Structures are given as C-alpha cells and as structure tokens.
Design a protein around this nucleic acid. Structure first.
Ligand SMILES: [K+]
Ligand SMILES: [K+]
Ligand SMILES: [K+]
Ligand SMILES: [K+]
Ligand SMILES: [K+]
Ligand SMILES: [K+]
Ligand SMILES: [K+]
Ligand SMILES: [K+]
Ligand SMILES: [K+]
Ligand SMILES: [K+]
Ligand SMILES: [Mg+2]
Ligand SMILES: [Mg+2]
Ligand SMILES: [Mg+2]
Ligand SMILES: [Mg+2]
Ligand SMILES: [Mg+2]
Ligand SMILES: [Mg+2]
Ligand SMILES: [Mg+2]
Ligand SMILES: [Mg+2]
Ligand SMILES: [Mg+2]
Ligand SMILES: [Mg+2]
Ligand SMILES: [Mg+2]
Ligand SMILES: [Mg+2]
Ligand SMILES: [Mg+2]
Ligand SMILES: [Mg+2]
Ligand SMILES: [Mg+2]
Ligand SMILES: [Mg+2]
Ligand SMILES: [Mg+2]
Ligand SMILES: [Mg+2]
Ligand SMILES: [Mg+2]
Ligand SMILES: [Mg+2]
Ligand SMILES: [Mg+2]
Ligand SMILES: [Mg+2]
Ligand SMILES: [Mg+2]
Ligand SMILES: [Mg+2]
Ligand SMILES: [Mg+2]
Ligand SMILES: [Mg+2]
Ligand SMILES: [Mg+2]
Ligand SMILES: [Mg+2]
Ligand SMILES: [Mg+2]
Ligand SMILES: [Mg+2]
Ligand SMILES: [Mg+2]
Ligand SMILES: [Mg+2]
Ligand SMILES: [Mg+2]
Ligand SMILES: [Mg+2]
Ligand SMILES: [Mg+2]
Ligand SMILES: [Mg+2]
Ligand SMILES: [Mg+2]
Ligand SMILES: [Mg+2]
Ligand SMILES: [Mg+2]
Lengths: 206, 243
RNA sequence: AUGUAUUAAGGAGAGUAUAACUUAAUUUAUGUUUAUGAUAGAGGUUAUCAACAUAUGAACUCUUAGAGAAAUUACUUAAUAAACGAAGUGAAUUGAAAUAUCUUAUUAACUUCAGGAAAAGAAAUCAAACGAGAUUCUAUGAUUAGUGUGAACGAAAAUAGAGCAGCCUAUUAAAAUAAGUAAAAUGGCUUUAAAGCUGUUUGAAUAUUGUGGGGAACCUUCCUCAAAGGCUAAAUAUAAUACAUGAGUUACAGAGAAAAGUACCGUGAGGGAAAGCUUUGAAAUAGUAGUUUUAUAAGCAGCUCAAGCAAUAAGAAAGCGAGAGCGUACCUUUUGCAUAAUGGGUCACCAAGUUAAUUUUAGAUGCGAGCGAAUUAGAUGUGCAUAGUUAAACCGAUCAUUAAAAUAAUGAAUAGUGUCUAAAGUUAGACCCGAAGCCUGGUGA
RNA sequence: AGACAACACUGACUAGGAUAGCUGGUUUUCUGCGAAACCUAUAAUAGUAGGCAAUUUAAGUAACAUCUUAGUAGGUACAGA
RNA sequence: CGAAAAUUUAACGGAUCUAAAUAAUAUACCGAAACCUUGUCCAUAUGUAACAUUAGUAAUAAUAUUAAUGUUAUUUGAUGGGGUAGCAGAACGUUGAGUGAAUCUUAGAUUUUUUUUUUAUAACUAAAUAUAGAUGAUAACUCAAGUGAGAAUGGU
RNA sequence: CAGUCGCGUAAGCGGGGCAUAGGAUCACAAGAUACAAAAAGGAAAGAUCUUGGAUUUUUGGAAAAGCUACGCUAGGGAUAA
C-alpha cells in the first residue's frame, strides 16, 4: 500500500515563534517548537506516502512464470485435468442445500467435513502440503468448498494467479484450458519472430 | 526447504550499503566523509562555481549556433538493406516504400523527418529493387541502378510519414497535377476509395522544391524540367559562345 | 495517508431521567419481518427483553430587529462561519557566493464581489501547403524553442488519460452581427521584437466577386479565422460526513488534542499543555542483609603479581581481597591538551546523508541491431541506439579548413537497450540544530 | 533624556515568509589501503576550484625504486687575488 | 676563587658516592610490544583431497560423475599485520513483512535475572520464580526501513 | 604542406625587430563567408573568418564614501585592555 506518513518540522502544528532568547537565559538556544530535538517535534526523515512498485521486463516476468511452471512440472506437482474442474459434491446434499431445507450451520458443517475427508483420501490435504486449484471461471462448488475448508487447499481464477501463488502450495491442480491460456499469455520472449502449445498426441477416447 | 525460502539474487548483484553517521568502526562515523568544518561540510557549493575564476565559456564564448530547421533523416545503408532481403524481411519484388521500411525495423522504431539511403556496402549490392525514400547519396543512386533497379526520391514530412504507417494516407510517386484538365479524373478516384484518405504534401519552399526538381537526386519533380533547364528556381545555365 | 460515495452555513450560553437532550429536556401512530429472523412465559421504573422502513408532537437564550458592557433590555412567527473561487492592490526574506536589471513572484498578504462550486468555454484558435477542430484537470513534449551580461526563468504544436455537448427556437428567455471600436504615436504592463492589457493625444474598413484579424521585427502572395453581442452540464477546488484499504501509529507514538483549543499564560491580538488500561517492572537513586576489606594512609578507583578469608558434610570457590608494580578521564577543537581551552549532575527515552524527479557509473541479469513500452482483422500511445562530420547545412564512409578542385596536410569510425542491488551529480528543507535582521497583516494609551 | 508608548523601544507586541563560506553535533562491529597543511586562480587569505594526489580494480609495463659502469648539464662549499 | 633574589634543600630524580667522579681502553651482563622459536587469530593467494547443499548427466533388479557455493584439512614448511582525514570490502543487531492455514509448547512455549559453554558486538547450557495452548514464541532464506547514541551550554 | 612574392652567381634565407618589459568574453563597429531564414518569396535579428576602439591598471576582467562611546548576531581568540 505504501501510505505510511509522518509530520516533519514543517508540518507539525503550532506557531513558528522562537522559544527562548538567542542569549541571556543560559540554556541552549532554541528556535521553533517543531524541531526534531523537541518533545512533539517532527521526524526529519520519516515515512511518507510514496510508490514502492518497481519494474520488471515483460520478457523477464514471463520467463519467471514459465520457470515456476516448470519447477512444478519436473517435480510432479503440476497435475493438469480436463475442463469443468469442480468438487464432485454429493447430489443429495446439493439437492437439499439448493432447496433450502438445510440451515447455513449444517450446510457449512458438511462442506467442511466432506472436503476434509475427500482431500485426505487423495493425499491432497493438509497432511500433504496443500493444493491450489486454478480454473478459468469461478465455479460455485469449488470456490465455496475451499472457502469453508481452507486448511485443505485453495482455489483461484486464472486472472488471480501470480508467480508467487504457483510456488506457495504442495501441488497445482490446473485445467487444460487454463494452462493453455496461462503459457500462451507468458511466452513473450518465445513469440518474437511456432512451438508446441497444446499439441495433442493422444485424443480422449469418447 | 521450501522454494520461496530458498530464492535469492546472484551474489554479484548485491552491494554494500553505506550508512553514514553510525559509529567510528563503520568507517563513516562522525564527519561522514565530509572533512572538517568547511563550506562542503556546513552547506552546499554551486556546481557551476569555480572559486571566482571565470569559466572558459565566458572567457572564450559559445561557438556557433544550433540549426533548429535542419531535417532529421533516418539514415539507411545498402549493406543493411541487402541483409533484410536475404532474410526475407523485405520483399524485393514489390515497391519498397517508407511504410514497408518503417514496419520492417531496418531503420528502427523511431519515425524521424525522413529516410536517406546511403552507400555503405555498395560493392556487394546486386539485388534489383524499386525503393522510394526521401533522399539518397550519389553513390547509392548509381549503386541501385547498376544492379538493375529503380530509385525515386519523394518529399515527406514527419506527419506524412506517420500516416503512411497508419494507413491514413496512400503512397504515390507522383505530385498532385495542376490545371482544370485533371479535376474530373482526380475527383473520380477520391469517391471510389470510399474512405477519408489524407494527401501526401508536396514541397513548398525554394530549397525543398529544388532538391526534388533535379535528376541528380532522382527527384519525383524532375519530369517538369527540360534537358537544358536547370533545377534552381533562380539561377540559369549560361550559354557558351562568343557574342 | 489515499481512494470511493454523499452532502453544501457554523458556533456558543443556560437548563435537563449522567447511554437517552431542550422547561413536552425517554412524544405519538402506521407497515413488514420476527430464529426457517435480522446482520404460546416474566417484565410500564424490578421499565425502555425489537429491529428495519415511513410519518409525527416538542425543540429555550445569544450570535441574528433597534439600542447595549453578546447570551440583557425591548420587541417579534426579525435569522447563513471558515476554507475553496474571480478581480483589484501587491511586498520582503532568498539566489546571483557583494549589488542596482533579474530571481524570490502575476507569490504571501489585504480589499471587494459571488456560488455550492467559481472561473473558462463552442475560434477574428492553432497549424504549414497535410491538416487539427470549445473550455477545464493530469502527465509527456521540456534542465527544449527562447529569453537574459549572468544566476536563473521558460512556452506552443502534438501525444496519452479523466470527462465529452453543443448552440442563438441558447430549455429560460440574450444580437436587428457590434465605431471613439480595431489601430497609430507616446508612458507603462506582459513578453522574445509578434499577439495580448492599458493612461494621454488621435483615429479605419464592410465578406472568398478576397472587406477585416492572425500566421513572433517588417512587406507581399497564399492559407486561416470572422473582434468591438451572448448562453452552456461533466471531468477541477475546498470543507463536513460515512465507508474501504494499510511491511501506517499503539500512548513523550499518532494530531496540539484517547475528556482540548480545555486547564494555564497574556491588558489584548495571541500562545498553548499534561493526562490511556487490570498486565510486565529496566537503569539511576535510597535504606539494610550476607561474604569480604578498611582507623600510618597522597590509586581516573582499572590493569599485571598475589598472601589470606570464604561451602557444617563426599564433591564443588564465584566473590572480596592485604601487600608489590604500571597507569596524569572522555570528547571536541588544534601545530600541539591531564591541561587551569570547549561540552556534560546521573540514568532511561526522543534526537541527524532520507524521499521524489532527473542525469550517470559499477556489478549482476533479460533481449539483442535492436531494446523498452503497448495491443476476427487493422491502427494506436513518450524514449535511446542503428553513421560520421562541420559553427551550420549541403554532403555522407566519408566529412571539415585549403576564397576552384585534387589521398598535399591534420582531426574524427564499428553493441546497443531494459531491469534490479549499491554508490552518486542536479533541483527540491536535502545530514541535523542555531542568528541578528527584512517585509506584510493585526493588537495595545 | 534617543525620554515614554503595559516582560521588550537608536522604533513595541503578535502572526505569516528566511538564510547562515560561521559554531556545535552526526549513533553497530570486523577487515584492507592510507594522506595533506604545497602550487595556480579567486573582492581572496576561516572559503572554493583545478592540480599534486589518498582509495577502488581492470588492462599494461623496455613500469617504478636502488646500485654498478660510461656519459652529460651546472659554478655552491672550498680555495684564490 | 670569580659565582648575589625573593614558599624549600632546588636543575646529581633521590639515597648516597673519594669513586658509585674524570680521561684513555677491555670484557661479561641487563635491556623494547624490535628480532627469534613454539602456538593462535586475521587478510590475500596457490594446487590437491574429503564432507554437506543445490542443479544436471549416467548407472542400477542380482552407485558414479560434472559445475557452483559453504566448510575442514593440506601443498608451496606461501605472503602479509600501527593509523587520523579519507576510500573500499564483509558482517551482526533492532523494527515490520513473505514462505506461515508452517514448526514447537503443563513431558513447561514464554519469563528484562543468574549461570555455563563456544573465537563470542552473538547465541547457547543449567538453575531459580511465575504459569501460557494462542492477540504466544520461533529456525532458515528473503523483503522494506521512523534500524544501532558517553557527547549538540540538545529535549522530556 | 599548398598558395605566390622579395633578395641572391649559387647554396639558400624570409610567417618583423640580438634575447628578456602591451589582457579575454560580452556589447559595438568595418570588411568578407553563403551557413540557417519560425507559412512561403525576401528581410530583420543570428552563425563562421579577419580587424578595430580598453590606466577593462583590483590588468582570469564590480559602475561604489564614512560614523556608531547606544550598536546587534555568528564566530576566532593570528594578543587585541
Ligand atoms: K562516499
Ligand atoms: K565539527
Ligand atoms: K557577481
Ligand atoms: K537555451
Ligand atoms: K503589441
Ligand atoms: K501526545
Ligand atoms: K528497579
Ligand atoms: K536515526
Ligand atoms: K530605553
Ligand atoms: K599499513
Ligand atoms: Mg517568524
Ligand atoms: Mg508529533
Ligand atoms: Mg526493492
Ligand atoms: Mg563497489
Ligand atoms: Mg576512518
Ligand atoms: Mg568525501
Ligand atoms: Mg573540506
Ligand atoms: Mg573578480
Ligand atoms: Mg442587534
Ligand atoms: Mg435580540
Ligand atoms: Mg505542460
Ligand atoms: Mg463580428
Ligand atoms: Mg488595442
Ligand atoms: Mg502583425
Ligand atoms: Mg490585434
Ligand atoms: Mg462571434
Ligand atoms: Mg512502520
Ligand atoms: Mg515511545
Ligand atoms: Mg593499617
Ligand atoms: Mg590555539
Ligand atoms: Mg583541576
Ligand atoms: Mg575543563
Ligand atoms: Mg558542566
Ligand atoms: Mg532513533
Ligand atoms: Mg547523426
Ligand atoms: Mg609536510
Ligand atoms: Mg570562509
Ligand atoms: Mg670556472
Ligand atoms: Mg638535589
Ligand atoms: Mg612483531
Ligand atoms: Mg606492524
Ligand atoms: Mg589495520
Ligand atoms: Mg527467565
Ligand atoms: Mg544529551
Ligand atoms: Mg520567411
Ligand atoms: Mg512569419
Ligand atoms: Mg586579479
Ligand atoms: Mg597569470
Ligand atoms: Mg597562536
């Protein structure tokens, strides 16, 4: 944010009269009351509202994005899935929650219990780091599930991901379309004149 | 352990921070590298100050003036023009115009007051092309024609060169005709285009008109001259003989 | 602190159910939902055990009729702060290492007038032979053009963003298109000599069928606009209120004010505090207790040598120390200080090379004759480098002097660009603290 | 009487706007190197600038210092009239 | 002998000395933080070996190796060692921040003390007192500074 | 080195004086140069080269008299009571 602020001797309240005479009182000669040497005087080099942001080349920022995406690929922590990446919550619960029979206290108490036991079977929960789900759009089940059970992981939208978010959890669970759009938006250094970007080797057996 | 707790810049990128006024052992302690009670310790000296002695620019004076009317050409050589064609970045079969010289990158990413074709590497240039620039050196005009090409020097400004890249103006190697026997054909063309295109300006001053009026520069106004006529709008070729 | 939204007159005196606010100082009614809400009881003083929305009774005195020593008199359905805005008048400190022009500065201040904003505004504008198309706000353009002996001062076109709106039949009522006007001389202002503002004395013309203004001395052609009449929202300024955010503060901090312009000081204008909570308990200082030394001695109280004392007990000696020697505090400032040269009663806390823009360098690293930025199809948004040369253009791997030229002579030629870390030059308070003075507005006999 | 005009008067008090080539102060440790008080210019001599020149670390060295051997410039001590 | 000054012997430092004075010689000894020797610390080198971390490259169903960085040892029985103004390098500490929805804590996290150890502006061992499950503390690496005070007739 | 002049039989000499004692910029003025010309054609005002007028004599270049015993501030105590 960088909004911290402090008052200098030129902003502190009060009059700019001289405190004690130049000579005659025997004490150290003093000027105005807003000097830093006084009790309520201003801080000379105090913080001020300024901009802390720096610059990073688009090409260097894109290389850092594909380096964090490859650091996960070689370690097996990049698990891409198909589209429609949402938590497969039971149908009965969804029918009751949508209907309104279930109160909030029970609707939330269940999502927390199910998401915890679902992530533990997959070895994807708090006992094994955590997981980050990156999807193109916001899905109710997923984003709502990881809002009540946050110890098991989190969910993010493709536009809400940074280079620091890929490196902050145990695993990255990303969608096929999300990845194709994630590497296609950060290949500035590559696309300057193409390379394989989503080339299909084995097709889904419909 | 964690990756975010194991990142750092190369050691060669970090440098010592000198905080003055923080103890004797630091090496920048009391005086803070200022000396002892001078003007450089108490206040600030004017940078232009030399102690009182007059500077040399006042003892000699400033020499010359800065020409504020000279055109800022975008220099282009033949050694570099041949490299773009061998790489396939400039089509030699089509006319090479400022729109295609600025969008290819040969002259850079800055559009200046014109484009001048120079003659560096004129010995290894053997590609027949049809180039159009604002100027051309004597060695670049005959080097382009020795290979079997054609060159024409047109008049451009900084604004007209920008409209050519933006497509707001169509390129043409001919000046606007003059007379009542051309309105019917020129106005015909404007309607057909079905767009608001701007026109390329023609020279107006004496020097500008004369530069593109002589065949030495291959000016696009050279067709207005007779073989015995001179390019200058004031001087004339005297006649040789006894009379 | 910034951002968003909303709003566009403020204070005091006295009184009162001490969460409740005006002599009625806890008024009286509606509608809806009420635990699946909203965000089958007890309880009218043993009260307000109900929130939201919409209405509603009451609301004193002064500022504020007249007078006066404001909160009184006397009457009566008497009533509008500050900041922000425009114009008028207009300094000085400061810089130029003095100082007159200049800078500070179309500044501070004062004076009048006006509104929730005001001002300005739909070209007698800019451009340059192509064209743009009102005003206002922000950045770039620009430590530029330019001015000036200097120090310094300093545009416009254009570009990008915020807003966008045009008109005279103005959405609130206005022109029969502007004459003592444009302009000239002269005295000033502004400024580059133009354009613009102006006191004195003078004084024009009537539309592209080329009349008039401008295009930076000036004349002409061309271009361009149409003064001497008007209307116009938004983006902008300030204050109040509410909310959001925080590698902002957490009590000598934050604000001057966690009960504050209050207590207190001053005839007055004016100056202007301290003080959080139930937690923790540092140092200095004081009175004692244990161990140890001390009444023959001339110690910056430390250091080197060290007898002895010191644990009821197997084991375990920190501490104090007689006696011997060495040692004339610290800092600052100086050629040089134990100096009888400067500074300090002790301890705790506060207290000084920082930030911004700009211009550089080193190292590291990205791209690479490109870099950076920025974006179904296309365009758009500063910059630096890619070529040198001269006073300058022409010219150009060649250029300049040689009054013609010419290897006659002499000089100059080849990886840039962005980012981060650090150190820097420049301009800003500019590492911190400290004058006497000068100017303007007020106060007091 | 340079007298008085409310602590202040060779021109009061109060608020707003300064500079100071002068003085004082500038806070943790370790490591490497290590000066000068001279010349020139300056309304300058308490300042400043350019040198000499301290530091950093790269490229160079027929580097620099000292001695030996041969050579060269220049007139002091001394001695003399 | 000449040779006289005002606090006190008053320029042998003093005691004292007939040499323990003076002149010409000789030898031993003492004597500095100088030098030597044996160790230590630090700075800069030069090759080699080994250990750890990180990142590659190969091998493995019957581990080896390459590079960078840290570290110890060792080769040349390597060289070097005062310091103001000043210049430069390398670190520690303080406050806040990320990794952190992490790690640890009545089997005692935390306790301004005391104590112990380690080439040590720092942390650590133990002890004593009190009692916290996080509005607690925290390694490592990194990020930003209102970051370090015996000195301003400084201020509270 | 180029240009083109003098003297000398020639070699050759000549970019003032046997040597050592005469200040810029700015402004201004007179010649040349043909560089740029704020819409354009010219011009004005600029630019280069040569040259001139200077107790610019504080001669690296201010247009410049004193008093304060009523003095003020910041300092040094270059010894000033
Ligand atoms: K420095
Ligand atoms: K000092
Ligand atoms: K001056
Ligand atoms: K200029
Ligand atoms: K005028
Ligand atoms: K306070
Ligand atoms: K205490
Ligand atoms: K500080
Ligand atoms: K008096
Ligand atoms: K040394
Ligand atoms: Mg004042
Ligand atoms: Mg404060
Ligand atoms: Mg940073
Ligand atoms: Mg460095
Ligand atoms: Mg030092
Ligand atoms: Mg220095
Ligand atoms: Mg100095
Ligand atoms: Mg002078
Ligand atoms: Mg009245
Ligand atoms: Mg009244
Ligand atoms: Mg601007
Ligand atoms: Mg009119
Ligand atoms: Mg006029
Ligand atoms: Mg005119
Ligand atoms: Mg006019
Ligand atoms: Mg009009
Ligand atoms: Mg902070
Ligand atoms: Mg505090
Ligand atoms: Mg005794
Ligand atoms: Mg002295
Ligand atoms: Mg004493
Ligand atoms: Mg003393
Ligand atoms: Mg004292
Ligand atoms: Mg501090
Ligand atoms: Mg160039
Ligand atoms: Mg010396
Ligand atoms: Mg001085
Ligand atoms: Mg002789
Ligand atoms: Mg004696
Ligand atoms: Mg030694
Ligand atoms: Mg030594
Ligand atoms: Mg040392
Ligand atoms: Mg403790
Ligand atoms: Mg102190
Ligand atoms: Mg002209
Ligand atoms: Mg003009
Ligand atoms: Mg002089
Ligand atoms: Mg001289
Ligand atoms: Mg002296």
């Amino acid at each position: 944010r960088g909004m911290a602020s402090t008052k200098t001797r030129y902003e502190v309240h009060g009059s700019h009269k001289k405190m004690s005479p130049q000579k005659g009182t025997g004490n150290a000669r003093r000027g105005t009351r807003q000097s830093p040497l006084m009790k309520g005087g201003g801080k000379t080099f105090g913080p001020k509202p300024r901009d802390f942001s720096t610059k990073l080349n688009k090409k260097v920022y894109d290389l850092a994005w594909r380096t964090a995406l490859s650091y996960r690929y070689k370690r097996g922590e990049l698990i891409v899935t198909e589209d429609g990446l949402d938590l497969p919550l039971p149908n009965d619960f969804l029918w009751l929650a949508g209907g309104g029979k279930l109160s909030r206290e029970l609707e939330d108490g269940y999502v927390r219990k199910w998401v915890h036991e679902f992530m533990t079977s997959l070895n994807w929960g708090k006992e094994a780091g955590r997981t980050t789900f990156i999807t193109g759009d916001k899905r109710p089940n997923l984003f709502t599930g990881f809002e009540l059970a946050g110890a098991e992981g989190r969910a993010l939208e493709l536009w809400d991901v940074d280079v620091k978010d890929l490196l902050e959890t145990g695993r990255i669970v990303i969608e096929r379309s999300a990845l194709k759009e994630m590497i296609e938006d950060h290949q500035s250094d590559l696309v300057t004149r193409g390379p394989n970007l989503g080339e299909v080797l084995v097709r889904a057996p419909r | 352990a964690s990756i975010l707790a194991s990142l750092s810049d190369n050691r060669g990128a970090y440098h010592k921070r000198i905080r003055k006024g923080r103890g004797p052992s630091s090496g920048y302690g009391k005086t803070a590298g200022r000396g002892t009670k001078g003007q450089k310790a108490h206040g600030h000296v004017k940078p232009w100050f030399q102690g009182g002695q007059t500077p040399l620019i006042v003892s000699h004076g400033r020499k010359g003036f800065v020409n504020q009317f000279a055109a800022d050409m975008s220099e282009l050589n033949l050694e570099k023009l041949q490299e773009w064609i061998e790489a396939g970045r400039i089509d030699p079969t089509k006319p090479i115009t400022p729109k295609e010289i600025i969008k290819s990158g040969i002259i850079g990413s800055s559009i200046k007051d014109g484009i001048k074709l120079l003659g560096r590497g004129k010995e290894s240039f053997k590609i027949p092309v049809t180039i159009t620039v604002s100027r051309a050196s004597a060695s670049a005009i005959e080097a382009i024609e020795a290979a079997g090409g054609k060159i024409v020097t047109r008049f451009y400004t900084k604004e007209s060169l920008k409209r050519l890249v933006e497509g707001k103006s169509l390129h043409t190697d001919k000046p606007l005709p003059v007379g009542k026997e051309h309105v019917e054909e020129i106005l015909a063309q404007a309607r057909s285009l079905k767009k608001k295109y701007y026109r390329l300006p023609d020279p107006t001053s004496r020097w500008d008109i004369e530069y593109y009026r002589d065949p030495a520069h291959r000016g696009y106004l050279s067709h207005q001259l007779a073989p015995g006529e001179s390019p200058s709008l004031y001087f004339k070729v005297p006649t040789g003989g006894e009379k």
